[PDB]
Design a protein around this motif. Sequence first.
Motif, PDB file in Angstrom:
ATOM      1  N   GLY A   1       0.801  -1.225   0.000  1.00 30.94           N
ATOM      2  CA  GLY A   1       0.000   0.000   0.000  1.00 30.94           C
ATOM      3  C   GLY A   1       0.830   1.269   0.000  1.00 30.94           C
ATOM      4  O   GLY A   1       0.395   2.272   0.580  1.00 30.94           O
TER       5      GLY A   1
ATOM      6  N   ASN B   1       3.631   5.624 -11.880  1.00 35.18           N
ATOM      7  CA  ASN B   1       3.066   4.325 -11.515  1.00 35.18           C
ATOM      8  C   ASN B   1       1.563   4.451 -11.413  1.00 35.18           C
ATOM      9  O   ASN B   1       1.131   4.947 -10.374  1.00 35.18           O
TER      10      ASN B   1
ATOM     11  N   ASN C   1      -2.819  -1.967  -5.044  1.00 33.77           N
ATOM     12  CA  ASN C   1      -2.977  -1.848  -3.567  1.00 33.77           C
ATOM     13  C   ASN C   1      -3.336  -0.428  -3.131  1.00 33.77           C
ATOM     14  O   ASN C   1      -3.359  -0.189  -1.915  1.00 33.77           O
TER      15      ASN C   1
ATOM     16  N   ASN D   1       3.532  -4.257 -13.878  1.00 31.59           N
ATOM     17  CA  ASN D   1       3.333  -4.379 -12.429  1.00 31.59           C
ATOM     18  C   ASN D   1       2.830  -5.796 -12.087  1.00 31.59           C
ATOM     19  O   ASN D   1       2.739  -6.707 -12.949  1.00 31.59           O
TER      20      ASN D   1
END
Length: 366
Positions: A118, A182, A187, A254
């Motif tokens: 996270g 990104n 998350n 990812n």
Amino acid sequence: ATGDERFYAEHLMPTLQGLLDPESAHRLAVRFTSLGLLPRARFQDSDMLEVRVLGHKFRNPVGIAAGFDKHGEAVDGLYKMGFGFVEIGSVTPKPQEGNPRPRVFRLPEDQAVINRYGFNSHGLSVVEHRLRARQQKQAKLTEDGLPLGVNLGKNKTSVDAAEDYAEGVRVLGPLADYLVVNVSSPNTAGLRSLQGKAELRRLLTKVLQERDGLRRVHRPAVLVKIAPDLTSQDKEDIASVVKELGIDGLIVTNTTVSRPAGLQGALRSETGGLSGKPLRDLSTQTIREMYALTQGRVPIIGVGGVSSGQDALEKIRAGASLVQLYTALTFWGPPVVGKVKRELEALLKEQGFGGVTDAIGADHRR
Ligand SMILES: CCn1c(CO)nn(-c2cc3c(cc2F)c(=O)c(-c2ccccc2C)cn3C(C)C)c1=O
Ligand SMILES: Cc1cc2nc3c(=O)[nH]c(=O)nc-3n(C[C@H](O)[C@H](O)[C@H](O)COP(=O)(O)O)c2cc1C
Ligand SMILES: O=C(O)c1cc(=O)[nH]c(=O)[nH]1
Ligand SMILES: [Cl-]
Ligand SMILES: [Cl-]
Ligand SMILES: [Cl-]
Ligand SMILES: [Cl-]
Ligand SMILES: [Cl-]
Ligand SMILES: [Cl-]
Ligand SMILES: [Cl-]
Ligand SMILES: [Cl-]
Ligand SMILES: [Cl-]
Ligand SMILES: [Cl-]
């Protein structure tokens, strides 16, 4: 195979991973690496492995993926491991703790990991000061073919995602050879929605305007890192936006929120992104499709399940100019870097390639 590769993979890493919780293992690895407490990187990079892309020389095409060194603590030790380039992050504007522990899970039967960190981040200010302390050392490393990437994220509670990325460009852009937007963490709630066409065009226009405002010697390349879980429509849209705006490259991919049939690990049904071997071919086929959609004109950094020279070369032949790994390092340890490089060099020679450059996208020309 070296003595070190076998000893690390068969004995040391399984013994250490058996004594440590997975996040404790991650933290200790960052400390070992930052202190240079590393086996000798015996492998000497050959001319065959040099790649020129993104406005830089890369001594070899094997990098450390984002997530290992989230806070820029271990950069010099990662170059000592033999990586041709280092990516740090993701870094968020403000410090944030991330999800509650436990939040990383080992699937050794699958050579996989699931994580839900996270975006635990020291934040832009701390990382900025950390990179400033070694800014001229990095300038020499980059000139010597060892570039630095910085991966940017967004805070959990931010109300303006584009402003978080813009802040990252302004603060860390001047310290980076490339930046990564990104938009593909599984998350952070709503983050992957930023891959949609209208949202991505608006976001990337703002990021590129901020990057273009930096002084020339401080002006990095900008890449977008994408998920392996995109629809065909999503991929076509990303390719369209990248070409329209002149994005410098893509990082593909990812972690996956899918759970491929056949996972054996007891922890397969944990929430989070899956990495390592089960991701490998899903990542390779995403590279292949993004290379085709961009007509081979957009550099790709290929990532997901690389643990061998064959894995690296399959991504290169699919369209990657460079590759990254992380999860393999959790099973094999530091000797995996020289293993991948040695195997890749041998395969390039076996397949009649003069070097890495000649192999980029070679499958599309069959
Ligand atoms: C996904 C989180 N995660 C996990 C759990 O899933 N493991 N892990 C990790 C652990 C590592 C290493 C590299 C890694 F990525 C590594 O390279 C070394 C190590 C050995 C000898 C010498 C020098 C070094 C640096 C030692 N360890 C542990 C076992 C202490 C890591 O990031
Ligand atoms: C523990 C962990 C944390 C990660 N954190 C990040 C992150 O902060 N930013 C990012 O862009 N990717 C992150 N990733 C994804 C990796 O950079 C990479 O894309 C993915 O793990 C696939 O490569 P691998 O199979 O070699 O691990 C993380 C991966 C792992 C395993
Ligand atoms: O911080 C994380 O949880 C994370 C971010 C990311 O981009 N990818 C990932 O697998 N985990
Ligand atoms: Cl070095
Ligand atoms: Cl675990
Ligand atoms: Cl900070
Ligand atoms: Cl600066
Ligand atoms: Cl631009
Ligand atoms: Cl630069
Ligand atoms: Cl689809
Ligand atoms: Cl699934
Ligand atoms: Cl999930
Ligand atoms: Cl091969």
